[PDB]
Amino acid sequence: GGDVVRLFHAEQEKFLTCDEHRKKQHVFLRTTGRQSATSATSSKALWEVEVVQLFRFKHLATGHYLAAEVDMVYSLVSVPEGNDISSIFELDPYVRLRHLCTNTWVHSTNIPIDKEEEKPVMLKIGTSPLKEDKEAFAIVPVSPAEVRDLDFANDASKVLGSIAGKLEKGTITQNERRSVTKLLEDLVYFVTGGTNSGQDVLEVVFSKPNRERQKLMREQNILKQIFKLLQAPFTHAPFRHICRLCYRVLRHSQQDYRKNQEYIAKQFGFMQKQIGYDVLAEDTITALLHNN
Numbered sequence: 001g002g003d004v005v006r007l008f009h010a011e012q013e014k015f016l017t018c019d020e021h022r023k024k025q026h027v028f029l030r031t032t033g034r035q036s037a038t039s040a041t042s043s044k045a046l047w048e049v050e051v052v053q054l055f056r057f058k059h060l061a062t063g064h065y066l067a068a069e070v071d072m073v074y075s076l077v078s079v080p081e082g083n084d085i086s087s088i089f090e091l092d093p094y095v096r097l098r099h100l101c102t103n104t105w106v107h108s109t110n111i112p113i114d115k116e117e118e119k120p121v122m123l124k125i126g127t128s129p130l131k132e133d134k135e136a137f138a139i140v141p142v143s144p145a146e147v148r149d150l151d152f153a154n155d156a157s158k159v160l161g162s163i164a165g166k167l168e169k170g171t172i173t174q175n176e177r178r179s180v181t182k183l184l185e186d187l188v189y190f191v192t193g194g195t196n197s198g199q200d201v202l203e204v205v206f207s208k209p210n211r212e213r214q215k216l217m218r219e220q221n222i223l224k225q226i227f228k229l230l231q232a233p234f235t236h237a238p239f240r241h242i243c244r245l246c247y248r249v250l251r252h253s254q255q256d257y258r259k260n261q262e263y264i265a266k267q268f269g270f271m272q273k274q275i276g277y278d279v280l281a282e283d284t285i286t287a288l289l290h291n292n
């Protein structure tokens, strides 16, 4: 009741996760390339248990609930609210999950959701009328720290996205600018496990990255929002300060982390193209035409 956990499929050696694909939310078992299945820990695999009176599972990263509906005949899905009876499951002990509403048991499949992708990693999950034996889940407890971290990252992501949208449309208030400035500094402190504050350049020599947090920055769309912020002015001193901090968060988010380096370099390339390579030349001509 209130506990946060990961649901690890024993036979498949994959965690039950929920993420967006093709601009849609999907529930699935995630294939990992790691040589240690239990090390493939994603914030998108965190579920908060709710005691009905038997159980409901709330996807912490999106607030939606685990459910099942006709697509084995049914398939696990994500739903906006936890009111329907379709989001209620029964645990039968390692535990097997029975979907009350349909009286079916959670069963894994090899049907990938990300077809187009080379070597897909999203495997659909359904329910079978028969109670299998190799379709059990290990309930993996999640540490309070990881939960607190997700809560902060989730809030940060919303603030950055919000402020970014406003900045795209023009400008922001003094408080919003002050808030985003403080948040970016907090993000530096956060991702470097407190080794850097982001207040000066000299301290960079002692920065040490917290890998799980760097990963969180990417997964919870913090990095995505940062680029949105960087792009906004192309679509004073405090503004430059905000941009400097944006690049600082990017720096520590990719520090000694190959996956984030490629992700960030890719997003930077996209932003550059989206902005246009001639935006400054065109702007200078326009300014001169208006005698400036």
Ligand SMILES: O=P(O)(O)O[C@@H]1[C@H](O)[C@H](O)[C@@H](OP(=O)(O)O)[C@H](OP(=O)(O)O)[C@H]1O
Binding pocket: 031, 032, 033, 034, 040, 041, 215, 258, 259
């Ligand atoms: O070999 P490297 O350079 O360490 O890179 C890791 C490798 O690609 C893992 O397979 C991947 O896990 P998944 O296959 O489960 O994605 C992990 O992602 P993560 O950092 O997002 O866990 C990468 O960081």
